[PDB]
Structure formats: C-alpha cells, structure tokens
RNA sequence: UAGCCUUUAUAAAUAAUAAUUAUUAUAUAAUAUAUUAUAUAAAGAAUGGUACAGCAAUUAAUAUAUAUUAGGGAACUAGUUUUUUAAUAAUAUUAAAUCUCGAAAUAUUUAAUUAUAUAUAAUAAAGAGUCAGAUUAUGUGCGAUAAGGUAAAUAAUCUAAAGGGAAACAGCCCAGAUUAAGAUAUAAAGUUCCUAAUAAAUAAUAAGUGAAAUAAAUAUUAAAAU
RNA sequence: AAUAUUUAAAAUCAAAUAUAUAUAUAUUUGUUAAUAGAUAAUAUACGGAUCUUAAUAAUAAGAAUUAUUUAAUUCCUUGGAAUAUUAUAUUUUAAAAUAUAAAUACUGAAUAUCUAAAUAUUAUUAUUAUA
RNA sequence: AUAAUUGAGGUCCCGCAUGAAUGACGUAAUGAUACAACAACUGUCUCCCCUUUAAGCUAAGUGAAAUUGAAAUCGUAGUGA
RNA sequence: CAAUCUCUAAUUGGUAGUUUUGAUGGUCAUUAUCAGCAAAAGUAUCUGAAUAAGUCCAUAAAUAAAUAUAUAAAAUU
RNA sequence: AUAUAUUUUAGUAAUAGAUAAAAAUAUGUACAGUAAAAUUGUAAGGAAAACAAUAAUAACUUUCUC
RNA sequence: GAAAGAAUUAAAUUAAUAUAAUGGUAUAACUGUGCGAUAAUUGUAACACAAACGAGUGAAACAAGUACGUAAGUAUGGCAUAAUGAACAAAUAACACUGAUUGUAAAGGUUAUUGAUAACGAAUAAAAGUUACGCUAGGGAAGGGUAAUAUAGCGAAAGAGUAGAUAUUGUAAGCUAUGUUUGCCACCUUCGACUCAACAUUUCCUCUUGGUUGUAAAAGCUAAGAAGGGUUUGACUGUUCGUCAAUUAAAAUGUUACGUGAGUUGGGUUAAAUACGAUGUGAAUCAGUAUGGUUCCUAUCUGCUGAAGGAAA
RNA sequence: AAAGAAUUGCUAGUAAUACGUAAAUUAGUAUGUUACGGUGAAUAUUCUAACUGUUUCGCACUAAUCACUCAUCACGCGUUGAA
RNA sequence: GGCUACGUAGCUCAGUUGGUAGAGCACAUCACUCAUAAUGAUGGGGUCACAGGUUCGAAUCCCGUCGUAGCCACCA
C-alpha cells in the first residue's frame, strides 16, 4: 500500500549516499521468504526509483491477477526520499526540493515474489522477466531451490551456515564489563555496595 | 532561496590524559557532556563534568565492582598500584607536605595562626 | 598574528622518532585449588562507535482462510455465520546522513626497554617568505552516483624536481642531477623492425577480435556442469 | 539423444600448506567463448610498419593477440641431483660412443656499487711551519 | 492593395502601460525628415558584354610606411594553458 | 524706520566637501545543538536542519510556643 | 427558674504527612522516594476528565505457633 | 506453618530536567520534605584544557566570613554545552595614591558599577543615488569539459491496426549513441544578406533490393545497399526561420570559429542626438518602441591560382 | 407601577359605569351575540387634511389619475445615409 | 533610563470651570398608503478606558499599572 510512498511525519530532505556493497556477506533480503517465485537482482548494485518498481509491479500484475489465489509480494519499499534541483538553474544556492522516492537495492537482493493456485513455474518466469525490462539492473529468476546470490559471480546457501548460542560464546571468551558484573553480583562486594 | 549555513564550532571533548600517563594536581584528565566517565580515585570533577586530578600520579581508567555500568577515570599515587584498589586494604594517601628544617621559617609557622 | 622556513647558541639534556613488552586463554614443568617459568594460540595495556553487521528501542515498509476490537453487508427465527473494512496484537520478513543492542582494520595514545646520536625534541636571541594553489587515489557534501565542475578530509607528486617509462604528457608508474667516469647490480617500463633488449611451456581466439585510452541492455551461435 | 536450469570451489570434489600425524582438524587454490548490438563531418590512425603459417623442403618461419606460467625438463630439499637438449672436441664406422661447456634470460635511469675529482661536517692519521 | 504582403492606408477597442499648454484633435502650405503606393524610367537585377582614360605591369631616376625575440617558417591526425 | 558692523536663530543641491560594507534577488554577517565528520580531536561549501539563543528564576508563610492561676515564699517550691 | 456584674468562648477556612509526579519559591544544605506508557474496570464519563489495580520472594532478622 | 521487617533481584531514565538539540542523570543530576535563603560571599589563585593575539573553560590549594548537617562534610549560582560587545569619551560612588610656588582645591589615578558599536575585533559624533558624456590603474584573480535537456537508435511490447502486439503503428518505465538545440561549468576575455563554396550521410530526388490478411494495377507506406549527379524563384519581415504564391525529379539534414567582414554589405544588434510608453522624488533607467548615425590595411611567411629562371640527365 | 408614533367610540336618558338582569345556540361549556332595565355626565365652530352632494376655473383623462404619457438603455427584423 | 497630554455606547459624539448614565446616528417591529420609500414612535447598549484615595457626596481632582505615540536624556 505505502511501500512506494511512506508516510514519514516529519518529510525532509536526505543527502545522496552510496548503494551498500555488502562486503561482509548479508544475505538479508536476499532469500525466497514469502512465495515460490521471485525476482532478484543480478548486477553490481543499483538505485531503483518508485515509478520504475511501479511499472515493474504493474507488469507483474498482468500475470498474476487471472491466476486463482495469485498473489505478488513487493519485497523494498522505496525509503530515501531524493530531492532534484532542475537542469536549468545554476550550481549552488541551496538544495533542490523533493522529486521522487528510491530504494537502494545490494547486488543479491529480492524484488519480487509470486504464487498462484494454477501458477506453471515457465508463466512466472516470463511475467519476471518482462519485470525486469522496465527496471535499470540486470535481473534473475530465483525459485525456492536456487540458491542465494551474494557476490556478481558468487553463490551460498543459508542452510550451510553455522548455528551459535551467542551467549555461551559470551561466557567463554568474556567482556570486561561483563566480568565487572559478575563481580557486583558476588557477596563481597553487594553486601559492602552500601546504597 | 534561502540556505541553512549555520553552524557552532567542534567542542574539543576527548579525554585529555591517558591511561598510564603521569598527572600533576589540577590537570584536566577529560572533558566531556554528562558523566560518561564518573570521577574515580584521587580524582575531583567539576561543573561541566570535568575529570580532573586532585593529586600528582598515574592516570588508570579502570571498572569498579561496587559500581557496575559505570566506567572510571581515577589517579594512581604510583605506577605499582592496580587503580580499582582492593577495597577493605588500607588507602594509600600522600602526606604531600615538607617540613620546615629552617629554624625561621619553622618560627614563622609556628607564630602563624 | 599563529602554522610551515632560515641563522646563531644553550644544557645536572634523550625529554624526539620507530618498534617491542603490557593482555586473555591453552598445554607442559616446578613450588604453595593459587604463583612462576617455558611453548603455542588469539587482530593481544587504555580510549573510540565508522565500515561491516543488525532490526533491539526510535523512525519507516510488507504479508497472514491467525487472534481481538468495532463497522458495512447477509441467511434463518434482537440472537448467528460468512465475505470482509481499518486499528491493535501475534508470527515471519525488510532499511536509516542526523538508529546502533554486535563490531574491525587504520587511528588516538602511556610507561619502561631496544634501535636511531656524523640523529632528534625543547628552550634562548634574531631574519623571512607565504595566506590565488593544482592533479592523482580513497571516503563524502553539492550537482543528475554529470563536468578538466564545486566544497572540504587523508596521502603523494607538481608547485620549487632535472632523469627513465606512460607515442607526445606540470600533477600517473619509477626515481631525487656536487663533478666526472661507464665495469657491475638494477627500478618502473620494455625485448619482430622503426628502437636499446628473448627464448620457452600449456590452453583459448579466427573476429585483425585484439595488439597502452576495455561501449550497455539485449539477440544469435556454440562450450561446460547439473 | 530430449527437455529445463545454472555458468558456480559457498557447498561439493580434487590439489597444496600448517598443527597431532599412513588419519583428523584448520587454512589456501581451481568453474565459458565468439559474433552482432557499434554510429559525422580536413585523412587510414594499434605511435607507425605490420602481426593469425604451410606438408613437399630447407644448418632456418609458424602471433608480434588473449589467459596462466617458466627461465632447458623432471624429482628431492634459493640449493643440489637426474634427464635429455644445444654447441664443441676426440675416437670409431653422414652416424654411434666418450667428454667439456651453457644452463647465473636480457635491455633499462642523472638509482646503488665500483672507478676517480670537489666542497662541508664527524672520527682517525701523515707532512710542513687557540702547535 | 499583391500571383503571394510580419510593410502601407482604412476601420474595430480588454488603451500590458492614450488624453488636453511634459497641451488634445483635424486641416492648407512648407520639409534633402521617416514609411508606403502608382507612373515613367532605366546595367539595380535576369547576366553580363564591349569601349575610353588614370593606375596596375615593364625600363630609367628618386625613394616611404605600419611590423619585426630569433628563424633552416609544409599537409594530416593525435597531444597540449 | 531703514542701512551698516558684531552676536544669535530659521532656511538651503542655490552652492561646496565627502560617502555610498562584504555576501545576494527584501534575505546572510554574533552565539549554541546534531548531521555532513570517514569509531581521538579538528573538518568546508549560498550544505540539511520541525533547529535554538540576544534569556529566565531571589529577598519569602510571619509572630508566639518554660516558671506560668488566688495566697505565701524564693534551697529549685 | 430568673436578673445584674465580671469573665470565657464563637472571627467558625482546608496541609495532621518529613507529604513524594495536580498546581505553587527555579540558587544552598540535610533527609527520603520513584516516574511514564499501556492494559482491566468503575455514577454522569463517551477516543479524550478522576480513582483503583497490573513482575519475582530464594536466603536473612524479629515475632507468634505445630 | 503464619505475620511483620529488612530488603534483594528484574525492569526502567520511554516520564522528569526553567528553555533548543545532543550527551548525562534512579548511586538519580528527577521528585517530595525540614532548615534556610546562605556560597547568586571577599583577597591570592597554581596547574591544566582550549588557544594567533584579544578572549574563553575546568580548577587543587592558601587566607576572611556565612548557611545547612549528629557527623563526614557540602555550597564561590542553576546536570552540562547558548543567554553576548573591545578600547576611547562621559557618568556615579568608594579608595587616600598624586596634588605643577606652598596650603586647600581642581584635575588625574586605583577599586566597583553604568549605557553599544547586530556589517556583532566595534573605521566617524555625523554620508544615499546616477553616467549610453565619462576617465585612470589593473584583472579577465564563440573555443574546451559535461550531456540534464534536445536529436537519433536499440531491447522489451501495453495498446491501436474491420480479425492478428511486431504491414503500418509502439504509452509510461529500460539500455545506448550524438555533440546538431536549451542549459550547467568557468581552463579559456556579432545575427542576416551577397560571393565562393569544401566535407559528412543520419538519403529529399535519381539507381539496385526485402516486407507490405494492410504489395491486383497505379499511386503509396516501411526497411537494406547507395554520397555518382542533382537538390528554387518570388510577396512579406533585418531576420535564419516562418506564412503564402508559382514551380520542380527533389525542393534532405547537418559540419566547416552556428565556413566565409586583412573577400563585399551593414538591414538587425550596437555609444554619443531626440521622442514615446512604463520605472524613479530626481539625475536617469528598460530580457521596451521608434528616426538618425565611424574603423582602416600597398600581403613578410604558410597556403592556393597562374608564369618563369636554375637544376643531376 | 395607567402605557410610545399613532388611534377607536360617543352630543343625552347618549357616553360612562369594579350596575346588574334575561334568551338564542347545548347533553355540557360565552371574556362572544342579541336583548332589558338601574345610576347618569362632560363639553360645542372656527382654521386644515380626507369623503360625500353643490359650485368656479382647468382638463391631451373616457376600463375615466391604480388615468394618460415622454426619452435614453437593453432584445430582434427591415429601410436609408456616411465611409 | 526620566517628562508629558489623550483612550464614554455597536457608530459619531456630548459632557469639561464637581451635587447626570443623556443626544441624535446606521440597525430590527408596527404605523398613514394602488405599492415602495421619505417622514412619525417602539425600544435596544454604556462597569462613563484598566483600577485605588480626599468631600454623607468626584465619570470630573490626587492617579499603581495598560494601549499607542510624542519628548528628553545616553548616544562612547
Ligand atoms: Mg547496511
Ligand atoms: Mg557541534
Ligand atoms: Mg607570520
Ligand atoms: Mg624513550
Ligand atoms: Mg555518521
Ligand atoms: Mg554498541
Ligand atoms: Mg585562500
Ligand atoms: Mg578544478
Ligand atoms: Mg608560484
Ligand atoms: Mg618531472
Ligand atoms: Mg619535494
Ligand atoms: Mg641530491
Ligand atoms: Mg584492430
Ligand atoms: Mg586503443
Ligand atoms: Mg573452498
Ligand atoms: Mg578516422
Ligand atoms: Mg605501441
Ligand atoms: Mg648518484
Ligand atoms: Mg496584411
Ligand atoms: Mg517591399
Ligand atoms: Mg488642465
Ligand atoms: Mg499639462
Ligand atoms: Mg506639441
Ligand atoms: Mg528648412
Ligand atoms: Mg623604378
Ligand atoms: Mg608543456
Ligand atoms: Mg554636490
Ligand atoms: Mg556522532
Ligand atoms: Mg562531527
Ligand atoms: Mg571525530
Ligand atoms: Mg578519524
Ligand atoms: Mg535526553
Ligand atoms: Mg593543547
Ligand atoms: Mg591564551
Ligand atoms: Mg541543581
Ligand atoms: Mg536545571
Ligand atoms: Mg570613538
Ligand atoms: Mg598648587
Ligand atoms: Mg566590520
Ligand atoms: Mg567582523
Ligand atoms: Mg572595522
Ligand atoms: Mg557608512
Ligand atoms: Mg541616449
Ligand atoms: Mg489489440
Ligand atoms: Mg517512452
Ligand atoms: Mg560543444
Ligand atoms: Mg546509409
Ligand atoms: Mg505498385
Ligand atoms: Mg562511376
Ligand atoms: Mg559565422
Ligand atoms: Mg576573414
Ligand atoms: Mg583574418
Ligand atoms: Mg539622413
Ligand atoms: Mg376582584
Ligand atoms: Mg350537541
Ligand atoms: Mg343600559
Ligand atoms: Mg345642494
């Protein structure tokens, strides 16, 4: 409903920024969650506007709306409000008002997702497809057993990934301060505390 | 148009002493908004949250038990002595004073009241 | 005026610059469950909140044949069910210059030690010039993720730096001309000829693709792997 | 063969390094190409010539492009050893055997060394005449 | 009006932003004023040709000038304050 | 009266000497807070601010609160 | 029971608690305590006036008691 | 087993803080309450932070006095970071320091206090415009870059096309090229006509060819090759352009310092004169209108057009 | 708390009367209607509005002054000038 | 920083040298009239500008501030 208008009470202009290159190996945003077909970016990250995901959504929505219980789950929401000066005016003078709201979408990132009742997998292919040539990245088909992109050329599955209990990590390698509380709680020094 | 080009300077707020560093009475071990570190051993604070040292020493930031979620900035009469001093032995205080072997002088101190 | 430069000096002078030690844990050995030594591991005394990472709280976005709160319809005889409309909850998933609960490296930075003394800091007495800067790389603000643009941050060079390379070249890659000499090591860059110097190996290309200034979505044809 | 994806070393396998060690653990490395798309005004414009090799047939050429490499090739631990190569000499019948060598690729600055000369400072001397 | 007119004259009045001695309005005459039309005329033009004289050119005599870092002073493309 | 001299006042582009900021098409110039600011500090531009400041707050809630009531004392009665 | 005199009371006014998030003295010092939101209710009361209620007691001290 | 106390743990700083925003604050800096109303006091302040100077900030300690507290102690205004202004000249007090011959005085000094210079380090007590009649010193304290726009193309195809997205058409969004427009940047300080044109091809005509239920024919439409040759004369306007008239096989689009002023012109733009409308108190002014109106050049080199001499043939 | 501009009735058995009485209409209700007596006054014509009959003069009115009637302006359709 | 003199009703304005709550004015109702107004009469609201004293007695004097502006001072 919002998500390519949100409703921040107090509007304000935002500076430019840089799209994340997710060094560190996300993932978030970057896995099939709601549906069984999706949509993901391919390329080096990129600035997607609201009309553009409009059109896309649009474009996807040919598709969907004949098929029984079809469904399209629109992933980002265009958060950064982009402000334009115009090509007429000279350099400087303040900042430009408010055009347009964009969304900055990492290289692996989900845009779209789909399931209908009566949905073939090679229909949702071409609905994506047609998708992502209104939109300025290069874009892939990404089922449930397609595996997660991370990098341009690199692929992970979350499944592999390991499972911690970080408190327990905590408790044997231990923070300073986490030790100074431990001490607090012992009795030689909450008995003689003397608030 | 109209521009918002308005602005106050950088408040010079770091620490302005550091840990194992020498301090004479006075010196201002920190400046900061609000006690982010609370005044510790042989230590005074003043009006803007100041940390300042109330005798010459070594400069420790260090964690006390008794106060958990509060980090410490105090001073060390010595480089020998672990500033989250150990809590019922006694305080190592400096006298800080000379006396007046010159007979005049030692008069003079005497007569002043 | 300070910053940066110069001259002459001063010491109960190393205070300067660089790094190490400093911490945590493990194993082994020796003393009294602790201490010391040895070895190994760990981005390893103190200060920090950027990247990254994250959705906690704040601010925002999405979904539920889920629950509650009321409303609009609707079927039988005001009660009731369904298809719902919003809000709230629950569960799952997401992001931000002025969100950071996790969190680097670089950084700031302390003592002693070692190394730099044909070297540094500091102080004293005196002379200046300069206050139009430029480009390159990285991280940003503005601009349209435009400018040989503009604004500052860090480093380098040019400025004031000749020499080799980059065809030619203020700012790029090497390298700092006291005067020669030209045997030996070379730097960056090169070795068919122009032009100082080359031989090989294994693959791929057939398009002169390309051969020191890489042009995109997309299309066609192959090639591997499943 | 057919259909449909992916173009990947994360997983997986293979290979290599480091800790106890014929194994385990940890780390590091290995996963497409071509063409079209293609485009303005003095004149082709990789700097220019020119560069994709070919048996018969050469004491002889066969990228001068792209990618990964080496300094003849293969094992052992920069070094040695073996292997064939190439060149040469000797002996025997243009070939065979023996042995010697080459394997340090090279060019390249006003860099560094060497080789000499000058000035300045520091530290030692020698000669000659605040010695 | 012209084959055809952003010009000219006539007329209309949302006079962006006329108006009465910073005079208002309509005439006769005048004007090397400005704009437009008709007639006549023509080398203005279609479309230039021929001719004449003074230069230009050559020989003799006299004899400038601005300019000038030094010049052994080509094209193209590239580069580059 | 008026004229002249001396003093005093009104008026003056008549006339003379001067001036007309830095930044912009009325608005900005000093101070504080956050971001920009890249985990010390500092850090700009006609950068973004739901920006904020030229202050505000005081002489006041008092007095009384142990020898007391008739009579007699004054070792506390 | 009633008359006069001399007194006494009635000026009727909130805090009764070291008060603790209604409003009021905004700088000192001493002592003490904890807010808010949301939720469930309740006379007019309704989304929005007021009042109530809404995390855990292991160990310790004292008191009574099987 | 029960009651009471002491409390501890968890949570919380989301409320509250005189006031912005940030940091801090429950050990509360927040809130209540007693006393008080004092420390919103007086002389010396080292040492630090910050820092060009001027200033600014924290502050131990020494001495005098005060308030609260049993005490320990705490208080030199406010949880902190804004709440501001130099000198000079005046003014008011206190000080007992100087007292221009001596004594008084005046006047000056010390100490405390007063009002503003917001262009806010404040030039004076006190200052606005105009010039196209202008003058001097200097500085530059279309080309180049860019490609938002513009022009052209490509991919995908919603949708028109009597039916069929792709004969022809092609929304909004996507990917490029161009340097032909309007911009932006600031390295760099004249429009039109005439004359002669050279080059490009993104082709208007002519030649070849593919597609065209939308090629029967003929006219077309669209696309590929193709730059050999050709591509207008008049009325209006300074105009390029545009409107129209009459033609043409066609009347293509650019580049060339938007080619060409040491080749011509000078209508537009343009200074001095003048008027009009508007603006201004005015001098005068205008993304206004109108009449008038100033540059010249014998060619040294390059280059090109022709013509000779010398030369090695 | 005897009532503003204004406005109603009444010259005699009339008005006035905090003087009463009756009937018609009803099953029933009079502050109304129609009738009866009782007691009983005050005032008085010259000026002007109206409205009836009289008259003078006037009269463009005759559905008779709510009469008739004049011009611009506005709406349509002709005609003829100027240019 | 000091010194003035003014601020009645919804509108306009009296009143002022003390023993007052008064005018027409525009506004809503009836009134004579083919109908409508002009004209006649219904009534309307003032803390006599916030707010205190002296005379049993002040809207008027002595004023504490509010409003909007003058004037002086200071103007270095
Ligand atoms: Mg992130
Ligand atoms: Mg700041
Ligand atoms: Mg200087
Ligand atoms: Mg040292
Ligand atoms: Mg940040
Ligand atoms: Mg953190
Ligand atoms: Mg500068
Ligand atoms: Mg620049
Ligand atoms: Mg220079
Ligand atoms: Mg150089
Ligand atoms: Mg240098
Ligand atoms: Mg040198
Ligand atoms: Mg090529
Ligand atoms: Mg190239
Ligand atoms: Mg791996
Ligand atoms: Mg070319
Ligand atoms: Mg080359
Ligand atoms: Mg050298
Ligand atoms: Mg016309
Ligand atoms: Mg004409
Ligand atoms: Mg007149
Ligand atoms: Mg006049
Ligand atoms: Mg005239
Ligand atoms: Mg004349
Ligand atoms: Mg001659
Ligand atoms: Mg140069
Ligand atoms: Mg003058
Ligand atoms: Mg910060
Ligand atoms: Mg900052
Ligand atoms: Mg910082
Ligand atoms: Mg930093
Ligand atoms: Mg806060
Ligand atoms: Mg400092
Ligand atoms: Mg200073
Ligand atoms: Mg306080
Ligand atoms: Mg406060
Ligand atoms: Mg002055
Ligand atoms: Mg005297
Ligand atoms: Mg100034
Ligand atoms: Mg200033
Ligand atoms: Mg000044
Ligand atoms: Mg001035
Ligand atoms: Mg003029
Ligand atoms: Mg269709
Ligand atoms: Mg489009
Ligand atoms: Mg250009
Ligand atoms: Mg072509
Ligand atoms: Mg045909
Ligand atoms: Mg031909
Ligand atoms: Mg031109
Ligand atoms: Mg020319
Ligand atoms: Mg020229
Ligand atoms: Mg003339
Ligand atoms: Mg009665
Ligand atoms: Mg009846
Ligand atoms: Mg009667
Ligand atoms: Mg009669």
């Given at each position: 409903?919002?998500?390519?208008?949100?409703?921040?009470?107090?509007?304000?202009?935002?500076?430019?920024?840089?799209?994340?290159?997710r060094?560190?190996?996300?993932?978030?945003?970057?896995?099939?969650?709601?549906?069984?077909?999706?949509?993901?970016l391919?390329?080096?990250?990129?600035?997607?506007?609201?009309?553009?995901?409009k059109?896309?959504?649009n474009?996807?929505?040919?598709?969907?709306?004949?098929?029984?219980?079809?469904?399209?789950?629109?992933?980002?929401?265009?958060?950064?409000?982009?402000?334009?000066?115009?090509?007429?005016?000279?350099?400087?003078?303040?900042?430009?008002?408010?055009?347009?709201?964009?969304?900055?979408?990492?290289?692996?990132?989900?845009?779209?997702?789909?399931?209908?009742?009566?949905?073939?997998?090679?229909?949702?292919?071409?609905?994506?497809?047609?998708?992502?040539?209104?939109?300025?990245?290069?874009?892939?088909?990404?089922?449930?057993?397609?595996?997660?992109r991370?990098?341009?050329?690199?692929?992970?599955?979350?499944?592999?990934?390991?499972?911690?209990?970080?408190?327990?990590?905590?408790?044997?390698?231990?923070?300073?301060?986490?030790?100074?509380?431990?001490?607090?709680?012992?009795?030689?020094?909450?008995?003689?505390?003397?608030? | 148009?109209?521009?918002?080009?308005?602005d106050?300077?950088?408040?010079?707020?770091?620490?302005?002493?550091?840990?194992?560093?020498?301090?004479?009475?006075?010196?201002?071990?920190?400046?900061?908004?609000?006690?982010?570190?609370?005044?510790?051993?042989?230590?005074?604070?003043?009006?803007?949250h100041s940390?300042?040292?109330?005798?010459?020493?070594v400069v420790?930031?260090?964690?006390?038990?008794?106060?958990?979620?509060?980090?410490?900035?105090?001073?060390?009469?010595?480089?020998?002595?672990?500033?989250?001093?150990?809590?019922?032995?006694?305080?190592?205080?400096?006298?800080?004073?000379?006396?007046?072997?010159?007979?005049?002088?030692?008069?003079?101190?005497?007569?002043?009241?």
């Amino acid at each position: 409903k919002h998500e390519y208008a949100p409703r921040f009470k107090i509007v304000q202009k935002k500076q430019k920024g840089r799209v994340p290159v997710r060094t560190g190996g996300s993932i978030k945003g970057s896995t099939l969650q709601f549906g069984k077909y999706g949509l993901r970016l391919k390329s080096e990250g990129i600035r997607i506007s609201a009309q553009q995901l409009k059109e896309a959504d649009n474009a996807i929505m040919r598709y969907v709306r004949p098929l029984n219980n079809g469904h399209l789950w629109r992933r980002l929401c265009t958060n950064v409000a982009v402000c334009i000066k115009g090509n007429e005016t000279r350099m400087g003078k303040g900042k430009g008002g408010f055009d347009h709201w964009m969304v900055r979408v990492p290289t692996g990132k989900i845009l779209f997702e789909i399931n209908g009742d009566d949905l073939h997998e090679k229909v949702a292919r071409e609905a994506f497809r047609k998708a992502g040539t209104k939109l300025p990245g290069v874009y892939e088909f990404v089922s449930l057993d397609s595996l997660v992109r991370v990098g341009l050329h690199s692929f992970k599955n979350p499944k592999d990934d390991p499972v911690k209990n970080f408190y327990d990590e905590n408790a044997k390698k231990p923070s300073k301060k986490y030790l100074n509380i431990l001490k607090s709680q012992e009795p030689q020094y909450k008995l003689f505390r003397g608030r | 148009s109209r521009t918002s080009m308005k602005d106050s300077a950088g408040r010079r707020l770091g620490p302005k002493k550091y840990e194992g560093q020498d301090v004479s009475t006075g010196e201002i071990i920190m400046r900061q908004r609000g006690t982010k570190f609370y005044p510790g051993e042989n230590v005074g604070i003043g009006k803007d949250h100041s940390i300042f040292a109330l005798e010459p020493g070594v400069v420790r930031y260090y964690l006390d038990p008794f106060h958990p979620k509060r980090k410490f900035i105090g001073v060390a009469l010595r480089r020998d002595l672990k500033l989250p001093s150990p809590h019922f032995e006694p305080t190592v205080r400096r006298f800080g004073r000379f006396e007046l072997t010159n007979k005049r002088a030692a008069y003079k101190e005497e007569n002043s009241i």
